[PDB]
């Protein structure tokens, strides 16, 4: 099951107010008009890759979808968060809670905090140790799938957990419709209005329309010719061609000679027909100081 | 909690304590002669009181006195590459006072630990709790140390009997990142009343300048702090005293 992710998934890269100005940034969004997977909520919770993020959407009428667990192992082996709302309190903890055999909510405790008609979009992520809760509730008159429309997704609360997530599993309520778009380090033409709601966005590395859109810094491009980037035939492999040298070089000889010359008569040992690895040099930890002036101290091998 | 503390973390599991909802004065830190090295290229030491910061994290750990230049942008070293990486664009100020008499004991302060083996370089400000045995040779290592099997997380020994080059030294990254998050740790300066239609030297949350201050009708969202023009210069602000 596939879906055309029409316009959803735009949020605030930052929450600094801007007016009638188009800001371009590199950030993690899912592409517009892209392929996203379609799920149902009958009798499905595989552990999808949250490589850098996904966009969640819910068609809800009785508050069935209620939480998430994100992480790298998600089995209390790593720090993993659990979300429950018991009709009065918001509870987001990564503490060592007792998870069920199949993780559900009914119908290393370092982070020391202890306490259709609706579309709900939630993006829980980590960028540089910030945990951004992204939330939006939107009314609609549509039943078939996710609606077509623009919705800025704003931060609410930033909490100190700073967690590795590379693959995620959704949380069910036992006695979840969602979408998975792989985010990429892509550059995005973002539009702010005078009231401060992000009204539109462009994934501008996608198609020629969008490439012109973010090279011309405009959502409307005139008819014409525009250079956008550079095309280079990428190398498919690496070829190394060196002389057929067969003798290990006496670098060890000028390290382990029986005598060394003074500064009054130091020697010029000139070297040809050799192989120099320098890996034994770097593997030797004897170096008291290594001030390597022309060439890299590490990058020489 | 970060200076007069009873317990300091190590470089493998250094505490990343968000410091927020408090007043950061720094004046007692100036008056303290306890610091020996006060190095940072990001901010200045002495002219810091007038600035109000985004959010400050105190990275608490212990490394050697010769290793104090390793906590720097672009420095390459053993601990710098296996325990704690500093980005090239690092903003913030690292403080290293002398720990001649604090983080040491007669038998050896044996609770400070550090990684020495890794097959990859570290990301900035990462948290690696990897407890696998590093593989030195090509033989598979079934938890059995010995030949081609050594464990990376190495410890120190701190005794007052040890030499001053091996004596424990305290280095702490009070990481002063000025990032997007709302300012909460301002200087110990008294506030003044607000003036309109008259240009005045303003210092709003550390940002200095001159200009006129009139009320605005824009609905800044909660957690929305500044309005920047095309020049990213502050065009509008929300008063943090009155909304």
């Amino acid at each position: 099951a596939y879906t055309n992710s029409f316009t959803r998934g735009v949020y605030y890269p930052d929450k600094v107010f801007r007016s009638s100005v188009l800001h371009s940034t590199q950030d993690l969004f899912l592409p517009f008009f892209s392929n996203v997977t379609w799920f149902h909520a009958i009798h499905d919770n595989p552990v999808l890759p949250f490589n850098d993020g996904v966009y969640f959407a819910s068609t809800e009428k009785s508050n069935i979808i209620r939480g998430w667990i994100f992480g790298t192992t998600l089995d209390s082996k790593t720090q993993s968060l659990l979300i429950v709302n018991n009709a009065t309190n918001v509870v987001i903890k990564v503490c060592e809670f007792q998870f069920c055999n199949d993780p559900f909510l009914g119908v290393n405790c370092t982070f020391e905090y202890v306490s259709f008609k609706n579309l709900r979009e939630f993006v829980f992520k980590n960028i540089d140790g910030y945990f951004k809760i992204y939330s939006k509730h939107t009314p609609i008159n549509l039943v078939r799938d996710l609606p077509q429309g623009f919705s800025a997704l704003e931060p609410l609360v930033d909490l100190p957990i700073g967690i590795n997530i590379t693959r995620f599993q959704t949380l069910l309520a036992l006695h979840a419709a969602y979408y998975v778009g792989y985010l990429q380090p892509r550059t995005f033409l973002l539009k702010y209005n005078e009231n401060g709601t992000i009204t539109d966005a462009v994934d501008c590395a996608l198609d020629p329309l969008s490439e012109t859109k973010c090279t011309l810094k405009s959502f409307t491009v005139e008819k014409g010719i525009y250079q956008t980037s550079n095309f280079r035939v990428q190398p498919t492999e690496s070829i190394v061609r060196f002389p057929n040298i067969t003798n290990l070089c006496p670098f060890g000889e000028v390290f382990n000679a029986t005598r060394f010359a003074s500064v009054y008569a130091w020697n010029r040992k000139r070297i040809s027909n050799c192989v120099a690895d320098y890996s034994v040099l770097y593997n030797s930890a004897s170096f008291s100081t290594f001030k390597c002036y022309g060439v890299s101290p590490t990058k020489l091998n | 909690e970060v200076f007069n503390a009873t317990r300091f973390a190590s470089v493998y599991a250094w505490n990343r304590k968000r410091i927020s909802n408090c007043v950061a004065d720094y004046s007692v830190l100036y008056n303290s002669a306890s610091f020996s090295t006060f190095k940072c290229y990001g901010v200045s030491p002495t002219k810091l009181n007038d600035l109000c910061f985004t959010n400050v994290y105190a990275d608490s750990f212990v490394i050697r006195g010769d290793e104090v230049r390793q906590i720097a942008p672009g420095q390459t070293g053993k601990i710098a590459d296996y325990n704690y990486k500093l980005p090239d664009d690092f903003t913030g100020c690292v403080i290293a006072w002398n720990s001649n008499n604090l983080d040491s004991k007669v038998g050896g302060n044996y609770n400070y630990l550090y990684r020495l083996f890794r097959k990859s370089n570290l990301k900035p400000f990462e948290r690696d709790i990897s407890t696998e045995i590093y593989q030195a040779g090509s033989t598979p290592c079934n938890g059995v140390e010995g030949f081609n099997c050594y464990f990376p997380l190495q410890s120190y020994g701190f005794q007052p009997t040890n030499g001053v080059g091996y004596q424990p030294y305290r280095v702490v990254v009070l990481s002063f990142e000025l990032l997007h998050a709302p300012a909460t740790v301002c200087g110990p300066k008294k506030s003044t009343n607000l003036v309109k239609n008259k240009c005045v030297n303003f210092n709003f949350n550390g940002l200095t300048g001159t200009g006129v201050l009139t009320e605005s009708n824009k609905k800044f969202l909660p957690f929305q702090q500044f309005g920047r023009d095309i020049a990213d210069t502050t065009d509008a602000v929300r008063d943090p005293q009155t909304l």
Partner: antibody
Amino acid sequence: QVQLVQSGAEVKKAGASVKVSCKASGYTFTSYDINWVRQASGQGLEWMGWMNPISGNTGYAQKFQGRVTMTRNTSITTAYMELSSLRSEDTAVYFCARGGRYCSSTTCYSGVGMDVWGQGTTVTVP
Amino acid sequence: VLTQPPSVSGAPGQRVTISCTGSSSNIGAGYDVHWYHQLPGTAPKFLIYGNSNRPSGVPDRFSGSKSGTSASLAITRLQAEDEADYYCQSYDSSLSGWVFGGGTKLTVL
């Protein structure tokens, strides 16, 4: 600068257990792996296994599997070889080893037990 | 012991390649063989590890060579005073971590 203290001469009944100590403290012990090696009276030496003071590694050998466990008290880093439900083959002088290579050197060379411990004997006679 | 002149009566200078027979895991792969020596009159102070790798006061006359199924260390300059106890240890891989044999002894007549 390696300092080494152990238990003394003792006699114990068959089937008993010992809470033996192999106590290293007071220097840069971290570069050294405090392993375990024995020798019988008049025989060649034999290596029981390793104990790694470098933050918590465990791994045994075959000749005393099922009879011995090990733990380390990382505060002052006391080494153990817990002879529990003792048998006939442990009546000898029991010593520790010390992995002599420097661990901040990346090359994993041989263990050099340059300094050797005091004494340990569980003689099982009636 | 592994196949050497296992326990002979030897004066200090006997040019005896006191060997240490190892398999392909030991003679070829385990080239970091070290020689313990529980010395008569003190706790083992071998002062001879990594074959010819020497501490202070130790001569290069203990030559370490791997030849087929045979290790080597020897001495020179025949004298009377070097009655001592020798041991060879190899990384035996599938066996315990590093294992000796039977207890090589050097003694004079």
